[model samples]
Target: MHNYVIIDAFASVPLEGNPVAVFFDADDLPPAQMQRIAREMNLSESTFVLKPRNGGDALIRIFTPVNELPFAGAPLLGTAIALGAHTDNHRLYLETQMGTIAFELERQNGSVIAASMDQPIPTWTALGRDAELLKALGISDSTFPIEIYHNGPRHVFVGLPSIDALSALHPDHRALSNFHDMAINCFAGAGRRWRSRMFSPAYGVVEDAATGSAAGPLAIHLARHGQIEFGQPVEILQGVEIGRPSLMFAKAEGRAEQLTRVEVSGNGVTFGRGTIVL
Candidate 1:
């Protein structure tokens, strides 16, 4: 049997953000078994925790219902908090397929208030007049920028002119299928507050209420364009269209060409725990 805890990531309250199941001790499980367990849990993502093979605090493997990912934000953030419950350590280094990531826990008094994770450097590829993206999102015209950004997972970021336009999106499944191999993240906002929606049909997630992985690259994209300030955390609102209402905090340090820090932060609350008998 494997012990696990379910936590709501990127949420200030229960059921407001992305839910992830994290196995506390999965050192003995094989890759196939872990994938099957993730399918059974049917959460956006599930993670298995193991003793580090290298010199890290832990080694984590992330999986979706259909496939495994090199890195995932919700599971990373939620698992960090979950593992901290067993120790007094406020800092953790997780070994993932992408690489080793260090997360710092923010505490108020003695409780973990939030966890911030450093992400890989951001990269982008400009898409000139992305017609498929417009059709996928059901938008006719857009004046904002559009490009594919990557920190770990590749996501197409499309900026809309207004929040209303962002909120009214009803993507065509067929058109969205064209991007089934990747995720599409669209946002709209001026200044600090922004609204976002993410779709990843290929990864078995139709919509993600809170996309921590995308937040870091999105922050860098906006900051580079002068839409928002860098070197500080920026708040992003998402999942409101689906009624889940999620929030994320993203920050990056350095110039547009090069960044020394790319971090995403949010709170996670434990909702349930159980044992999965194998």
Candidate 2:
């Protein structure tokens, strides 16, 4: 039997935000079995905790229903929260294929109350396929140059005129899935408050409730376009469209085009636990 905890990654309470199933002490399971377990779990994403091969706290592997990822954002926080149950671990470290990453955690009643993670800074390139991409997305206007940012998975940002426009989007997922592994993130906001929607049928999820992986690059994207200052934190709202309200805070530190830090913070709720009888 394999034990796992179900936690809402970016939600402050239960039944909100994105949910992920974090399996513990997964060293016995092989990667092939892990992929099958991920498919069986059937969330946007699922994670496994294996023995720390890199001498970090734990070696973690991330997978979606369709494929494995080098890293993932929102789900990792829930993994940390699940780990917090064993000790008063204020700061937690988890290792991924990308590298060892840290989570500064706050706990209550032996459970993680909230946490912040240092995200990997991403490299970016302007995607010249805006015409066809926007055509597939059914939009004509974008507030910034279409760009794809890469940290682990690729995220393509498209700007909309307003939150109404962002919400009104009706994307052709089949056409979008043609662009594999590039998460199509559409966003609109003024000043520091914003709303976003992530669509990636390519990853086997048509949309994500909260995308921690996309948050840091978005801060970079905004700073590059002069909408927000470098090192300024922004509040991001997502998943409202699918009835799961999710909230995240993200920031990129340093001047435009040169960032020293990238981080995303959010709250998680441990909703339930179960065992997979194999």
Candidate 3:
């Protein structure tokens, strides 16, 4: 048997963030079993904590309902909060398939309130023309350019002239099915304030409430475009349209095209705990 908790990441309230199932002391659980448990949980993503093979503080494996992720933020941060409750340390080094990630924990009166994870160096790849990608989202306007950014997953970002334009997005699955291998991230707004949504049918996530994985890359993209200043924390408001308001804090440091120290932070609250019978 294994122990797990369902945590809502990026939520200020109880049920207003992305929910992730985190399994602790999961070294005995095989990868096949982890995948099965993730699908059984039926959340956007699930995580397992095991003894680090690379000499890090911990090792984690992330899984979606249909696939495994080399790295993810919600699970990483959520796991940190779950682990922080028992540790005297305030920092942790996590080993993932991508690489080693450093994280910092924030506490209030000796209680872990939030945590931040350092992301890998950011990069991007050019794909179909802006118009071609626009067709996928059913948007014909040329207000924003379309490009695929990367931290771990390939995320396609679409910028809009205003928040209304970003919020008005109605994805046409038939059109999106072509590039059905990438996550589509759309956003509008400038500086510390922003609004966004994510569509990831390719990864089995139709619409994600809070995507910490994309937050860092999105901040880097916007900073380069002058939509937001670089090297500063930007507040990301997501999932509002879906009635599950989520808040994610993102920051990136670098000069155009070359980014480093990309990080995303948020709070998670555990609402349910249970034992997984094996």
Candidate 4:
């Protein structure tokens, strides 16, 4: 048996953010059990912690209800806060599928802010495909422009015209699930300013409550497409349709081909802690 804690990351006060299930001391749980446990939790994502390796930060693994991921924002931040609070370490070094990443935690007056992983050097290019995306999203083809790119494995981003468009998006989850490129990400500028709402449905996730990994690439996408300026803070409002309203923050930097530091920040609240005797 192992003890675990659950939290809603990138959330405002109370339960307004994404929920992640974190199991500390999962060194004994096998990969098959991890998948089954994640499926049972039925959240957008879950994380497991193993003993530190090679003097690194604790070993962490993220899992969607259906599959494992190289990287994700909510789970990373949520796990960081959980472990940081549970352990003496103020900073958490994580070995995710994306790569080894680290985070620092801070809190005040029951509110918290976390500095999450940086995108390992951003790469921007166009995939030149929008017809199917429009068809799957149930939006007009002309309503969206094509500046899509695969910055990393299983990560895809699309820049929309406005936050309203991203908010109003209705992607056919069935179609999106069938498209097996990286997860589909769609967003527009922030609230009357630098903001974005991202969407992804291909990976059995209808709409993420808050996504930092995708937002990192989304920021770079906006810069390359001329939607946002350099070094601007982008407020991300996402996951409203799923009844889980989440707030995440990110700042954009640099342009195409150059490494832009995409910073995704958020708050996490310790909601529950218990032991699983199974």
Candidate 5:
């Protein structure tokens, strides 16, 4: 049996946010077993925390039900909080498949109340298949030029004409799955307040409640599109369509051309603790 904990990332309360099953001291768990365990847990994502190999606090591996991910945001944050709550470390640098990321945590009564981390600078490119893509999203015209951004998973951003269009989106899953290794994000809002829904059929998740990996890049997307100022933080509300409401805050610093920093911050609650028996 291996110890595991369920932590909800970007959630204000338990059962809200994106839930990740984090396994600690995962040195004995091989990649194949980890993948199997992730499938058994059947959450959007599951993480295995092993001792650091490259001079970091810990190393993490992310997995979905269908496949392993090179990097993921919610699971990383959830793992950080889980480690911090067990120790006195307020600052933790965790290594992921992407790279080592530094996280700062706020502690209260021996538990982490909130956490934020610097994200890798992501790059974006334009996609010419707007007609077919918009048809897959079940929306009309995109408010901004549809572009694919890469931080971990390839993220495609589609700006809806209004919130109603954003909420009413019923994308064809079979059609969307054609966009391999890409998360289709449909968002609509003004200024700092926005609502979004993410679909990644290729990755096995139909919709993500809170996507940390996409949140940081979203700030960058807004900055480049002149929706928000540089370094200005934006609030994101997601997962409401699926009953689990989640909130995320993200910011990108420096110019959109040469971004100095991209960060995502949020709070989570410890949902439960148990052991994985195999």
Candidate 6:
């Protein structure tokens, strides 16, 4: 029996952010075996780490029970924290499908002080949906206005007019599955919480508490469009309506008319760790 640790990723306080299961020392697990473990865990995303391959770097693969993802933010943060405390080295490199990534942990008195990570480049694509698309979400055009885009490859963004619309939403899961099979993240600025929701038909998750990958794209979009001011922390509330309320902080930057950096950081807690038999 192999040991696995489950941490609430993107969770600033214990039981606040999204829950994720992490398997450390996955160096020897086969791809098929790793995927099976992910399926058993039944989380949105699970990670597997392989020892440095070909003298390059350690390989990190993300599985969503149904398929493999090129990159994911929650698992990245969880994996970083797990290795920071669980591994022999304090600093480590993670080679993911996107590219090689690095992580660091701030420790004081041998306890984790805080953790942060920089996400990959954000890819923007105007989905170019018709006005009637608003009706697709069961909301009237006047109630909520949204801008849809692709920050990265795996996510689809739908921006609502007000945080209220996002908060008071009950999407038809059947309809959502019909359109976007995998997972769709919806976010709006609610004064109370980082009002948002994540639905994944592919992973059998109707609503995910927190999503790191989507946040990066949203942060990048805001920063590039001057929606978020610089030199100040931008606050976002998510997962409130879904019952697993979470908050995320971020800062975005660009250089030479191109988005140079999008850093989405969050604090997590080691709520508990367990093992799964394969």
All candidates: TM-score: 0.95, 0.96, 0.95, 0.85, 0.96, 0.85
Local error of candidate 4 at 10, Å?
1.0
37-93 per-residue lDDT for model 6 (tens digits):
888878777887667663434677889787787877778787777666755455567
Q: Order the numbered candidates by TM-score, best leading.
A: 5, 2, 1, 3, 4, 6
Q: Compute the lDDT of residue 34 as modeled in candidate 5.
A: 92
List clash counts for every candidate, in order.
0, 0, 0, 3, 0, 5
Candidate 2 per-residue lDDT over residues 78-183, each given as its tens digit: 8888888765768888999889889999877666778899988899999878888898899986889899999998999999989999999999887787787689
lDDT scores of the candidates, listed in order: 0.84, 0.88, 0.83, 0.69, 0.88, 0.66
Query: On residues 88-158, what C-alpha lDDT tens digit does candidate 3 reach at each position?
Result: 78898889998888888888877777888888776786656677678878887544557787777788888
**Candidate 4 pairs with clashing backbones:** 70-98, 189-195, 190-195
Q: How much is the lDDT of residue 149 in candidate 3?
A: 79
Full candidate order by lDDT, most accurate first: 2, 5, 1, 3, 4, 6
Query: Among these predicted structures, which one has the highest TM-score?
Result: 5
Residue runs of model 6 more than 4 Å from their true location after superposition: 54-57, 87-91, 142-153, 181-183, 190-194, 230-232, 276-278
Q: Which regions in candidate 2 have their CA more than 4 angstroms from the true location?
A: none
Which run of 10 residues does model 3 get worst, by summed lDDT?
Answer: 141-150
lDDT-better candidate, 4 vs 6 = 4
Q: How do the residues 1-278 of candidate 4 rate in per-residue lDDT, one tens digit apiece?
A: 97888888877555777888999889899999999999998987889998777566888888888888776777888888787766555566787655677676775542344546555555555555567766877877533345544535445565666667776776787766656656676766543244344455555565667766666666666565566666776667666667667777766666555655767777777778889886
Error of 4 at 151 (Å): 5.2
Off by over 4 Å in 1: 108-110
RMSD vs true structure, all candidates: 1.5, 1.4, 1.5, 2.8, 1.3, 3.1
Better of 3 and 4 by TM-score: 3
Clashing pairs in 3: none
Model 3 collision count: 0
- For candidate 5, write residues 25-113 as lDDT tens digits: 89998999999999899988899889898999988888987688887888888888888876787789898888899999988788897
